[PDB]
């Protein structure tokens, strides 16, 4: 249940970063784009793992870890500008 919040929260982070990206200048858009890519990628990973019964608690928790770190990072980048 906690991941249901985290994943959608990261979808929010993804969305907001997308909104910021289109408003940012190129260099900044690109850097935050990379962070967005990392975030969205682990987003997709977690989104997949939560539905994947083959994904183990460690795999899932690691996905949560990296997604969390990516949202922390991207969020930090959002707050930067």
Q: Spell out the domain ranges in the chain.
A: 1-81
Distance (Å, whole) CA 23 – CA 9? 21
CATH class of segment(s) 1-81: mainly alpha
Name the structure determination technique.
NMR
Distance CA 56, CA 27 (A): 38
Structure tokens at 81: 């500008």
What lies within 8 Å, CB to CB, of 1 at 6+ separation is: none
Query: What sign for the dihedral angle of Cα 10, 40, 32, 62?
Result: positive
Residue 37 is encoded by which pair of tokens? 């890519």
CB 54 within 8 A of CB 48: no
Contact of 73 with 38, CB cutoff 8 Å: yes
Whole-angstrom distance, CA of residue 46 vs CA of residue 34:
18
CA-wise closest residue to 34 among 42, 9, 53, 68: 42
- CA distances to 20, 53, 54 from 71, rounded to whole Å, are 14, 24, 25
């Amino acid at each position: 249940e906690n991941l249901d919040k985290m994943i959608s929260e990261a979808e929010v982070l993804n969305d907001m970063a997308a909104r910021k990206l289109i408003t940012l200048d190129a260099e900044q858009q690109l850097e935050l784009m990379k962070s967005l890519v990392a975030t969205q990628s682990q987003l997709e990973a977690t989104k997949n793992l939560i539905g994947d019964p083959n994904a183990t608690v460690a795999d899932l928790q690691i996905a949560y870890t990296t997604l969390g770190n990516n949202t922390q990072a991207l969020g930090n980048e959002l707050i930067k500008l």
